């Protein structure tokens, strides 16, 4: 079973990565597969806000520490979870109505996580899921209380905390070039970067249905037209795991110079958040599926 | 699938349980199977010392809180994870050399966790894996620094923290009645209870190879001869998952009045610590295996 990370590096990319966490690495065959076949690990849950700061100032780092240590001991790159988003946000944060307080709470959360792992994390998702489907800004507690400058503030705070990290904005449903959300994030990132905001990358959280891989061949070039140094495919899975869909997504990254790599949202189907759609590259016996072998063949040519 | 928890309750027992945690409940089909078929949940990792007190006096409860909330919402009993053992132990604990200090650290760890969930946890494993295979006490930091009184102190502290909870000592390789460790824990528990130590249960961490189920029919009655109010089988798995092995373990519990129930160490084979031995009751597609149906039939006769 050849390594898709080694093959994608040979094509000039940085990594083929996977989401994982402590109890994945201690069960199944996940550790062995990640050691052999993937070049970068991401925290499935252990760096999100609900996991890391469940009460104000009460930081929970045991899970993230385990992942970072494991990655360093096994020579893997590390991607950092989402620092600022609304999903599963603890109630103590969404209850805050004072602009100064929330600004400092946001800054402290960013700075504390990034400082702890300073120099060890290749890229951080600083802001996630900030856009509505129509392309307007999603009305989260951060937008409602801080205002539109919360995105500039978050990225400026992150850059100061670890200047070595690549700083990403991330969203989903960026999979079609004709979708308003895709066009909107490009336009806003262009305008933020022109004003000096340090957005190094756009990460596309690519959760696809059967047959949607082909659209990424046109969407990813559009995302790259925003002019960020990097773009990436994040937390990829595909209902049905057709080889055609997976190969199309891989070729989209190969076709876009600034695409640095691809991360898949888990190793084996039974550990997927949508396991009934068997959407990953390894089956419930940890055997590589046809999609894995099709990626290998596509990368060899 | 018919519920083995309902069926074991119909035979006069308390529960058929399973180990789980937050990222199991949000992936695969684990939540649906636990809702339908199991009556108790245990924390796979979220209550061990490395997860809950990675620095002195500074506790991490996000993962454990999630599990406790989920269980209460879904009407499930909750078993508490091992409070005092040598596994998953942070280096700050194992570097302590003063008896008074380590005693206070141990008491504070016990009291803090048990107080937080006071009244919500049916069972706590207070001390785990305290015995060598020859029946002598394992030379852990607790034994080396405090001495053999650490076990009485741990149980007396636990009883004061939550008098409602059933307090267990737990160990593995208690699966054969002629094995030295089995008689040794009986000897010591009888002594401790005669000295008024509040040991309510012996929990047998039952990790079996093929064909070893038959021996539990003699070992579990021997464990029960120590006179604790309860015994249980914890974190059960069986290499090969033979119906004969699983049914023999179930019948050992049915044969022992004081055996309150059985907990299996996960739901589906790919999420096992020894997945290559396919040792659990559901396969990698979340289908019940022959051993599951054999338990169903055994409990109905």
Author numbering:
A (entry chain B), B (entry chain A): 3 to 303
Show passages lifted from the paper.
HG3.17 was evolved from HG3, a higher-activity mutant (S265T) of the in silico design HG2 that was engineered post-design to reduce the active-site conformational heterogeneity observed by molecular dynamics analysis of HG25. Over an evolutionary trajectory that yielded the HG3.3b, HG3.7, and HG3.14 intermediates, a total of 17 mutations were introduced into HG3 to produce HG3.17, resulting in a catalytic efficiency increase of approximately three orders of magnitude.
In all enzymes except for HG3.17, the unbound state is never pre-organized for catalysis as both Trp44 and Met237 adopt conformations that would prevent productive binding of 6NT. Increasing rigidity at position 50 is expected when this residue is mutated from a lysine to a histidine (HG3 to HG3.3b), given the lower number of degrees of freedom in the latter amino acid.
